[PDB]
């Protein structure tokens, strides 16, 4: 079956350049065009351009004209997407896409997994963990504030507690750093006899925090 394997997530600063690869297999690379599509967070799909792996000729959307450069290395069935002078607008997941066949050349039957490119000048920073003290059932949580890059994981009592949890998605603050909160409802009788600990992990900055949440 057709496979479109893309490169890994990149984090670039404004004014830099990113290059995404898309290795194809399962068919003849030169027989079909290769399209590129991106998707800003919370947004729809946006077409960028296509390339002819036989000719190397390209055609980009007006929006990216003079901003993007598409190339291929047929020797390795790989297509490339280079976006220059990066803007905060360019934070998005970038897919490579290929049509069904010559008759239905714009019905993208095959998509790569996508490559998340994040454009930010923030330095790699770990989160500050603050408790949300509880006051039949009782709701408590943790505030994970001011961390960069985005992936943060939160557990409760090292996976022993999993029912009733609500780890909200992260929000991008004006400082360019992320923040979120993880809450969980528990029986009030548990507050007096059971202990609750947030298990935060921010792998990038190698920050792994354990915070106790006790009633006020």
């Amino acid at each position: 079956q057709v496979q479109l394997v893309q490169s890994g997530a990149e984090v670039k600063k404004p004014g830099a350049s990113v290059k995404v690869s898309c290795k194809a297999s399962g068919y003849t690379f030169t027989g079909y065009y290769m399209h590129w599509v991106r998707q800003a967070p919370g947004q729809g799909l946006e077409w960028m351009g296509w390339i002819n792996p036989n000719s190397g000729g390209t055609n980009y959307a007006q929006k990216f004209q003079g901003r993007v450069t598409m190339t291929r290395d047929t020797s390795i069935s790989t297509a490339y997407m280079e976006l220059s002078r990066l803007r905060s607008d360019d934070t998005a997941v970038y897919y490579c896409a290929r049509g069904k066949n010559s008759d239905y050349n714009w019905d993208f039957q095959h998509w790569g997994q996508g490559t998340l490119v994040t454009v930010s000048s923030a330095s790699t920073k770990g989160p500050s963990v603050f408790p949300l003290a509880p006051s039949g059932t009782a709701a408590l949580g943790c505030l994970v504030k001011d961390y960069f890059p985005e992936p943060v994981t939160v557990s409760w009592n090292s996976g022993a507690l999993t029912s009733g949890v609500h780890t909200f998605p992260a929000v991008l603050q004006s400082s360019g750093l992320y923040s979120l909160s993880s809450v969980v409802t528990v029986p009030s009788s548990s507050l007096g006899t059971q202990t609750y600990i947030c298990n935060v992990n921010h792998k990038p900055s190698n920050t792994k925090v354990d915070k106790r949440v006790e009633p006020k």
């Binding site: 239905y104 019905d107 996508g114 603050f130 909200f168 998605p169 909160s181």
Partner: protein
């Protein structure tokens, strides 16, 4: 430029029911229209091509029809895995997309408020969290009031995806202040309005 408008923005239906999605183009297109499914974190998937032909490995319940400027996608009887986002595509243009949501009985939110922690205040910042827990529908208005003064700009809220059991939602709203300005006031309230609430609910605390 061709503009593709999809409707509705959010389609709320129950499993087993029939769903009908629509996509309108600015200009006549004949029948060069495709549909796609996308779930969070996953790549799109082609459903229909040429407006009405099922793509590879697509269940029979999916189907589309139309021509020129009016197109529809129809799932004869929804199933759990069908709830997702759906896009239409014409040449180089995509639609805004429609989110297919699970419908269920109205559920009111459980409203809780959390004052700043002491450790955070030592560092000169104060964060106040207001939780709306396990409610439905999605829409909810959250307004902060400090000493009855309606606040703005200093709050940001976050909503969870639909719970895979009670199809409910959960929303957080964090109001960020400086320790200085947080001590200048006392009453911190969180006014919530939701269809499952006969009247608006306001939870608050003192000692600011």
């Amino acid at each position: 430029e061709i503009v593709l408008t999809q409707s509705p923005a959010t389609l709320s239906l129950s499993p087993g029911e029939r769903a009908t999605l629509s996509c309108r183009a600015s200009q006549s297109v004949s029948s060069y229209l495709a549909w796609y499914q996308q779930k969070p974190g996953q790549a799109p998937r082609l459903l229909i091509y040429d407006a009405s032909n099922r793509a590879t490995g697509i269940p029979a319940r999916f189907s589309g029809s139309g021509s020129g400027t009016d197109f529809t996608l129809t799932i004869s009887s929804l199933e759990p895995e069908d709830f997702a986002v759906y896009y239409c595509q014409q040449y180089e243009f995509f639609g805004q997309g429609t989110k297919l949501e699970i419908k269920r009985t109205v559920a009111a939110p459980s409203v809780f408020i959390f004052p700043p922690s002491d450790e955070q205040l030592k560092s000169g910042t104060a964060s106040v969290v207001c939780l709306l827990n396990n409610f439905y529908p999605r829409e909810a208005k959250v307004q902060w009031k400090v000493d009855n003064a309606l606040q703005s700009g200093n709050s940001q809220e976050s909503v969870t995806e639909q719970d895979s059991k009670d199809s409910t939602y959960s929303l957080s709203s964090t109001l960020t202040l400086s320790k200085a300005d947080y001590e200048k006031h006392k009453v911190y309230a969180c006014e919530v309005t939701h269809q499952g609430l006969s009247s608006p609910v306001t939870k608050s605390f003192n000692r600011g």
